[PDB]
């Protein structure tokens, strides 16, 4: 079975949004489903839970704004009155039926990112990083800078150069802009960086050769 | 206050069905909807349904009885004139017949014509005293009526108790994998439910009688009191009546053993004893069965006739009753009880109410659960309890130990 | 109001056996309390699916214990393979008033120290003409965490430092750090030599480069 989230995107304050969670390999009338969120650099927060009988339970900070729903396959969440306090990553958990009178979640998804700001999207700017006696093995890198929504994917030589890769966490700035860097090492043939931004749907290719 | 251990594991509250409905094939040619039922019995004379057999008056030896309706004395009519040697022999013959293979079940002996305690024989049961006097006169003429009546009581109590103790003990030590018991013992006597200021609270003297009937409880294994109903009562009256009957049935179980009390299989009916065609609605089922689940009984055994199980229309109506009212309630109360055990006690036993003079019950909150029927007739339960339900249960109710899980 | 509190919020225990992360409450909770584990950037994972019962696939011989209103999860075998952040959640369907997840616990593992090696990356072409310049310093396979400083031709800046730190390694608990400094084009053209400094203590690692 599987659990896969979707619907996370960029939104503007004061609006409303809907997320979906899709399943395969089981049925929603035998296993329950829960929604949890994680603010960047903070803890998990419990949004709600859906039973096998259709009953929906929420936490008291969320009653009046959030609403869950079910279908034959997908479990959806809907929210209103979005402020800057709602930026997070949203997961979807499935109950594995270890107990007959309590919920215990075993299968999790990957997560959707919800960004709440008043701006407009941007695209990244990809630069090469090559050091200026040289040895047989060298380290090269790719710098990604200036993009509004996360996440930005970086790969080396269609992923074939999957050895010695080192990818770094993103950083938020004072202008509402992110940054990221990546590095690999190769026996000295020039390396290629593929950088993809789904939100602006741009694929950028870079060829890096030592100076 | 402890409680008995369950006969069938994974079942703390057990259900038995003793009626001759084994013939009619329900609805849509399906023969049996008895999945919930651990024991199924058949009282037909030639039938061999092991689960809950029952020997009536007409079987199990040479039981004497003067028929109340216009009829003749049979086998003497008094336990004084019985041989007490042929009785046990024909009882051995019957025991050989009705259970050739030893298997788990409960056998009940249905004998009520006379009661083995003197002074409980008010009309129309005064006959067993009339004769009990005159026989003495036919043996001695010196004694007057007062002396003859006095010595009458000493040729009916001893006679009847030596009758029944032995009719059991040819059962208890012979095929002990079964559960032996007499029908409708004890009794409390609640017949004053029409006079003003009625409370079903058993009168003092009846409690004294069953307390001093203590010799029999030391013999049988299971008890089988009756929690029947009639349509001459009111809600409060019915609740108090059932409450006190079952509470006495549970108090009489302290005596034979004070650590692992007996199993009480409440003998009940789903039909009014005044109108024998009108079933019990769900609210009546509450203060009939829920007042039993919530006081500590080991289970419930239902009983029937052929009055509602002979015609095909009767089969259809009972099928509807099973598929609409009875089975959902059975799952309702059983799952409530098992949840009580597993959560609030860790399965040390079954939970029993705090103050009995109250209308608290063991039911599933409708805002969380869903008891439904999928295609095929197999019930499914959906949903899990909340914390508030457990809190209210843990305030109203409380637990107690098993006989093996103390 | 069901309030569940976690203490500690971050634990630092070396190789051996580390503490039992806790969980408190205010309304009686019998046995419906589950523990989860989440490494950085990954979804969590169910470890104890009651107050005491472990799930299939827990080779780190965990064992939780408790009941009533105070509960614990004991970490019996800790190495550089079980570094994450742990959580406790009430398992019964939430009452009208609730607060399920806790404040979270963090595990810091003090493994064998390593020596770092600074790489300094000059800003290639098509970066100074755009308007803003950057300098990147990468510290590879270091432990414990370091401090980053800059020498801009004898001027130590204070504003424009960005730091990014990796999740703890699954081989030797090693860290990797990345640091960036951003400046204007005129300021970059105003000097010639730059020096990135990484400090742990008496040992310090310095890289430098000058234009041309
Ligand atoms: C389990 O049984 C109880 C008792 O019959 C049900 O509770 C009653 O439900 C009716 C139907 O709405 C209410 O009118 C009563 O007020 C309830 N309480 C009583 C009679 O004390 C309960 O709904 C049943 N559970 C399910 C899931 O149906
Ligand atoms: C509401 C109600 O009936 N309460 C009963 C009361 O009627 C009875 O007289 C008394 C005797 O124990 O027990 C209680
Ligand atoms: C004998 O029985 C009749 C009714 O069956 C009753 O009226 C009569 O009082 C009884 N005899 C005695 C001595 O009580
Ligand atoms: C219960 O019934 C009898 C009436 O004789 C007595 O024990 C008592 O007065 C009654 N209790 C009441 C009415 O509360």
Q: Which two tokens stand for residue C105?
A: 């616990």
B112 is catalytic: yes
Placement of tokens 């390694």 in the chain: C169
C196 and C153 fall within a common domain: yes
* Domain housing C71: 11-108
Cβ contacts of residue B311 below 8 Å, gap of 6+? none
Q: Rounded distance, CA C139 to CA C33, Å? A: 41
C92 and C144 fall within a common domain: no
C159 and C128 fall within a common domain: yes
C125 and C195 fall within a common domain: yes
Give the CA count within 13 Å in the CB-facing half-sphere of A199.
Answer: 21
C136 and C201 fall within a common domain: yes
C99 and C149 fall within a common domain: no
The number of the ligand 2 atom at minimal distance from the alpha carbon of B236 is 3
Distance A175 CA to ligand 3 centre (A): 110
DSSP secondary structure letters along C112-168? --B---EEEE---TTSTTTSEEEEEEEEEEEBS--EEEEEETTB---S-EEEEEPPP
Q: Which residues pair with A95 in a beta bridge?
A: A105
Is C26's Cβ below 8 Å from some Cβ in B? no
Q: Which residues pair with A180 in a beta bridge?
A: A144
Residues on chain C touching A180 (C-beta within 8 angstroms): 164
Choosing from A97, A116, A135, the residue where a domain stops is A116
A19 and A97 fall within a common domain: yes
B289 lines ligand 1 (CB under 6 A): no
Q: With beta carbons less than 8 A apart as the criterion, state whether B255 and B215 touch.
A: no
Is C202's Cβ below 8 Å from some Cβ in B? no
B371 lines ligand 1 (CB under 6 A): yes
Cβ contacts of residue B29 below 8 Å, gap of 6+? none
Cβ contacts of residue B63 below 8 Å, gap of 6+? B57, B75, B87, B111
Return the closest-CA partner of residue C91 out of C33, C23, C28: C33
Domain count, chain C: 2
Strand pairing report for C20-24 and C70-74: antiparallel
Choosing from C56, C74, C108, the residue where a domain stops is C108
In a domain, C113, yes or no: no
In a domain, C5, yes or no: no
Q: Rounded distance, CA B61 to CA B235, Å? A: 43
CATH number at residue A139: 2.60.40.10
Neighboring chains of A (3 or more beta-carbon pairs < 8 A) = B, C
C16: which DSSP letter? B
Q: With beta carbons less than 8 A apart as the criterion, state whether A33 and A55 touch.
A: no
Please report the beta strands in B162-297, taking only residues with DSSP state E, as ranges in sequence order. Answer: 178-182, 265-268
Q: Rounded distance, CA B111 to CA B105, Å? A: 19
A61 and A104 fall within a common domain: yes
B14-53+99-110+183-398 architecture in CATH?
A: Alpha-Beta Barrel (3.20)
Tell me how crowded residue A84 is: count the other CB atoms within 10 A of its CB. 9
C133 and C62 fall within a common domain: no
Placement of tokens 């039993």 in the chain: B292
A13 and A82 fall within a common domain: yes
A and B: number of Cβ contacts within 8 A = 28
Contact at CB, B383 and A103, closer than 8 angstroms? no
Chain C: closest CA distance from residue A65 (Å) = 15
Chain B: closest CA distance from residue C11 (Å) = 31
Q: Rounded distance, CA B78 to CA B156, Å? A: 7
Q: With beta carbons less than 8 A apart as the criterion, state whether C88 and C21 touch.
A: yes
Q: Rounded distance, CA B396 to CA B137, Å? A: 61
A146 and A192 fall within a common domain: yes
Name the closest-CA residue to atom 14, ligand 3: B130
Q: How far is CA C105 from the centre of its chain?
A: 12
In a domain, C47, yes or no: yes
A59 and A11 fall within a common domain: yes
A15 and A103 fall within a common domain: yes
C190 and C131 fall within a common domain: yes
A98 and A132 fall within a common domain: no
Overall size of chain B counted in residues: 406
Return the closest-CA partner of residue B85 out of B67, B62, B119, B112: B62
B273 lines ligand 3 (CB under 6 A): no
Q: Which residues pair with A122 in a beta bridge?
A: none
* Domain housing A58: 2-116
Domain count, chain A: 2
B324: which DSSP letter? I
* Among the bound ligands, the one closest to the CA of B122: 3
Q: Which of B112, B134, B150, B391 is catalytic?
A: B112
Q: Which residues of B30-60 are buried (b: 16+ CB within 10 A; e: fewer)?
A: eeebbeebbbbbbbeeeeebbbbbbbeeebb
In a domain, C157, yes or no: yes
Q: Rounded distance, CA C99 to CA C95, Å? A: 9
Sheet of A191-197, strands arranged across: A153-156, A191-197, A202-208
Candidate from C50, C120, C162 with C-beta closest to A171: C162
The number of the ligand 4 atom at minimal distance from the alpha carbon of B197 is 13
Choosing from C82, C108, C134, the residue where a domain stops is C108
Choosing from C89, C108, C127, the residue where a domain stops is C108
Q: Which two tokens stand for residue C8?
A: 């500690």
Q: Rounded distance, CA B115 to CA C47, Å? A: 65
CATH number at residue C184: 2.60.40.10
Chain C: closest CA distance from residue B395 (Å) = 12
Packing angle of the helix pair B157-172, B86-98 (nearest 10 deg): 40
């Amino acid at each position: 079975q599987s659990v896969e989230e979707s619907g996370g995107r960029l939104v503007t304050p004061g609006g409303s949004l809907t997320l979906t969670c899709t399943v395969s390999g089981f049925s929603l009338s035998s296993n329950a489903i829960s929604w949890v969120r994680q603010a960047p650099g903070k803890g998990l927060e419990y949004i709600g839970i859906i039973s096998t009988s259709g009953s929906t339970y929420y936490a008291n900070w969320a009653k009046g704004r959030f609403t869950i729903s079910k279908t034959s396959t997908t479990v959806d969440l809907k929210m209103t009155s979005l402020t800057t306090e709602d930026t997070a990553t949203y997961f979807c958990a499935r109950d594995g039926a270890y107990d007959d009178f309590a919920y215990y979640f075993d299968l999790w998804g990957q997560g959707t990112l919800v960004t709440v700001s008043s701006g407009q999207p941007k695209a990244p700017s990809v630069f090469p990083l090559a050091p200026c006696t040289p040895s047989s093995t060298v380290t090269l890198g790719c710098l990604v800078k200036g993009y509004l929504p996360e996440p930005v994917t970086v790969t080396w030589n269609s992923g074939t150069l999957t050895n010695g890769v080192r990818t770094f966490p993103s950083v938020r700035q004072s202008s509402g802009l992110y940054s990221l860097s990546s590095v690999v090492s190769v026996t000295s043939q020039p390396v290629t960086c593929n950088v993809a931004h789904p939100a602006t749907n741009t694929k950028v290719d870079k060829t890096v050769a030592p100076s | 206050n402890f409680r008995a251990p369950p006969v069938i594991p994974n079942v703390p509250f057990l259900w038995a069905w003793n009626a001759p409905s084994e013939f009619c094939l329900g609805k849509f040619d399906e023969p049996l909807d008895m999945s919930l039922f651990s024991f199924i019995g058949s009282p037909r004379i030639n039938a061999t349904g092991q689960g809950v057999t029952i020997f009536y008056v007409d079987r199990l030896g040479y039981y004497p009885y003067i028929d109340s309706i216009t009829g003749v004395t049979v086998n003497g009519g008094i336990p004084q004139k019985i041989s007490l040697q042929d009785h046990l022999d024909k009882a051995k013959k019957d025991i050989t017949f009705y259970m050739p293979v030893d298997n788990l079940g409960m056998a009940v002996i249905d004998w009520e014509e006379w009661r083995p305690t003197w002074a409980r024989n008010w009309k129309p049961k005064d006959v067993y005293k009339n004769r009990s006097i005159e026989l003495v006169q036919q043996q001695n003429v010196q004694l007057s009526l007062t002396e003859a009546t006095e010595k009458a009581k000493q040729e009916f109590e001893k006679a009847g108790k030596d009758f029944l103790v032995e009719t059991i003990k040819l059962g208890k030590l012979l095929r002990p994998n079964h559960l032996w018991g007499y029908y409708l013992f004890p009794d409390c006597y609640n017949h004053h439910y029409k006079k003003p200021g009625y409370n079903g609270s058993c009168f003092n003297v009846e409690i004294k009688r069953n307390d001093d009937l203590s010799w029999l409880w030391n013999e049988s294994t299971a008890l089988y009191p009756s929690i029947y109903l009639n349509t001459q009562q009111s809600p409060v009256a019915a609740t108090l009546y059932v409450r006190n009957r079952v509470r006495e049935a549970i108090r009489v179980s302290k005596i034979p053993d004070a650590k692992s009390p007996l199993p009480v299989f409440a003998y009940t009916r789903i039909v009014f004893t005044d109108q024998v065609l009108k079933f019990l609605s769900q609210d009546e089922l509450v203060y009939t069965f829920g007042e039993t689940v919530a006081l500590g009984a080991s289970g419930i055994v239902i009983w029937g006739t052929l009055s509602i199980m002979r015609s095909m229309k009767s089969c259809l109506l009972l099928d509807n009753y099973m598929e609409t009212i009875l089975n959902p309630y059975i799952i309702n109360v059983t799952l409530a009880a098992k949840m009580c055990s597993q959560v609030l006690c860790q399965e040390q036993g079954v939970c029993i109410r705090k103050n009995w003079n109250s209308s608290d019950y063991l039911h599933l909150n409708p805002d969380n659960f869903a008891i439904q029927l999928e295609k095929g007739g197999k019930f499914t339960v959906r949903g899990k309890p909340t914390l508030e339900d457990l809190e209210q249960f843990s305030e109203k109710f409380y637990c107690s130990c098993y006989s093996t899980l103390s | 109001a069901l309030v569940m509190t976690q203490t500690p919020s971050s634990v630092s225990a070396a190789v051996g056996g580390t503490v039992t992360i806790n969980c408190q409450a205010s309304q009686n909770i019998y046995s419906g309390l589950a523990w989860y584990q989440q490494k950085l950037g990954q979804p969590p994972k169910l470890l104890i699916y009651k107050a005491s019962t472990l799930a299939s696939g827990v080779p780190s011989r965990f064992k939780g214990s408790g009941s009533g209103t105070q509960f614990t999860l004991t970490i019996s075998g800790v190495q550089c393979d079980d570094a994450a952040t742990y959580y406790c959640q009430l398992a019964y369907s939430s009452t009208n008033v609730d607060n399920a997840f806790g404040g979270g616990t963090e595990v810091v593992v003090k493994g064998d120290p390593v020596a770092p090696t600074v790489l300094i990356f000059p800003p290639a072409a098509d970066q100074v003409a755009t308007g803003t310049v950057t300098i990147v310093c990468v510290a590879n396979k270091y432990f414990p965490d370091v401090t980053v400083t800059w020498e801009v031709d004898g001027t130590t800046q204070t504003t424009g430092i960005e730091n990014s730190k990796t999740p703890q390694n699954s081989a030797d608990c090693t860290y990797n750090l990345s640091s960036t400094l951003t400046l204007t084009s005129t300021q970059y053209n105003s000097h010639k030599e730059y020096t990135c400094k990484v400090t742990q203590g008496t040992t310090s690692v310095v890289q430098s480069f000058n234009r041309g």
